Every structure is written in C-alpha cells, then in structure tokens.
Amino acid sequence: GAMAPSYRVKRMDIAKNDEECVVNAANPRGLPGDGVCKAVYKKWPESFKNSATPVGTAKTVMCGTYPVIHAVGPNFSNYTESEGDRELAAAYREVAKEVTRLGVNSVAIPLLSTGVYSGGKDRLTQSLNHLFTAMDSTDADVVIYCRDKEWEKKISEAIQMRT
Numbered sequence: 001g002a003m004a005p006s007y008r009v010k011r012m013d014i015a016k017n018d019e020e021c022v023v024n025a026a027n028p029r030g031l032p033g034d035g036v037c038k039a040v041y042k043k044w045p046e047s048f049k050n051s052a053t054p055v056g057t058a059k060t061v062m063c064g065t066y067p068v069i070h071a072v073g074p075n076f077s078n079y080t081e082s083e084g085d086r087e088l089a090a091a092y093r094e095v096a097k098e099v100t101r102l103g104v105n106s107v108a109i110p111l112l113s114t115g116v117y118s119g120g121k122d123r124l125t126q127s128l129n130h131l132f133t134a135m136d137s138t139d140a141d142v143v144i145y146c147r148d149k150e151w152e153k154k155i156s157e158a159i160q161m162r163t
C-alpha cells in the first residue's frame, strides 16, 4: 500500500501515466476502440489478448509485467439512467477488486462512461462519486486522468472538498 493513500488529478494522456498500473475505459469486445481505449491500445497492444469482458466488469491482462485493467462502463445511449447507474457503480467495484489483488501501490484511472458512452450528458459528478465509493477502501495512490481544463478544476475541487 501507499504510505499515505491519496487522490490526485492530472490533465494529460493516461498512456503517459507514472503509476504501477492503468485502468482502460474499455469496450466489451476488446476492440481498439476510441478515446482512452485507443491510446491504451497504441501503448499496450499486447494487453488486448482475450480482454473482452461484459459491461460492469473489469478484466486484467499483463503487458510485460505492467497490468492493464480493462473496465467496461455502460454506454448510456443503450442503458436506462437507472440500469446504467448500477452498471457504472459495478464497473468501479470490480476495478477496486483488481487493484487490491495486484498489490500495486498506485493506479491511473479515467472517469468511466464520461466520453462517447456518456449518452451526450455531463457525468463528471456521477462517475467520480462511483470511483470514490469503490476506491475509498483501497490503499493505492489513485491518480485520475482527464483531457479538459474545466474537468481538471471540478475534479480537483471534489477531491479537496473531502479533505
């Protein structure tokens, strides 16, 4: 575990993380996909061997000795708000289990279901709060990765609000 487990946010490509493992915002079929998933495919393509896994689950595949945790959030274009919310919460619970099993001291995580799976809605708070619910009981340093300046500011304020 980390000496003083913390949350941090960085605005940069998760493919250039400085943590002991990465969470992919995966699709259920293990395809190269778009956005975070395509950056992860370019950096760790070996990790996509038998990476397909259902919505609301996480499946870890090694790239060398570096673990890629493929976490499948719901596409809110297909799910109802209610069922989507349940699957998004479930995906993060499975990420916490994998991070624990791996024994890593740090993990790089994107906000699941906030990009092309958002159903055209701002889901920063919804996704971040499900991340906190899952990861609060783990002792890994969590570093949250985002793209846009507005998002960095709001994620930083939410982290600072609980301290």
Ligand SMILES: COC(=O)c1ccc(O)cc1
Binding pocket: 012, 013, 014, 015, 034, 035, 036, 038, 039, 110, 145, 146, 147
């Ligand atoms: C924080 O999100 C990313 O790391 C990311 C990487 C590549 C993309 O094309 C989009 C997002």
Ligand SMILES: [Cl-]
Binding pocket: 011, 012, 013, 016
């Ligand atoms: Cl970058």
Ligand SMILES: [Cl-]
Binding pocket: 025, 112, 113, 114, 115, 116, 117, 118
């Ligand atoms: Cl997404």
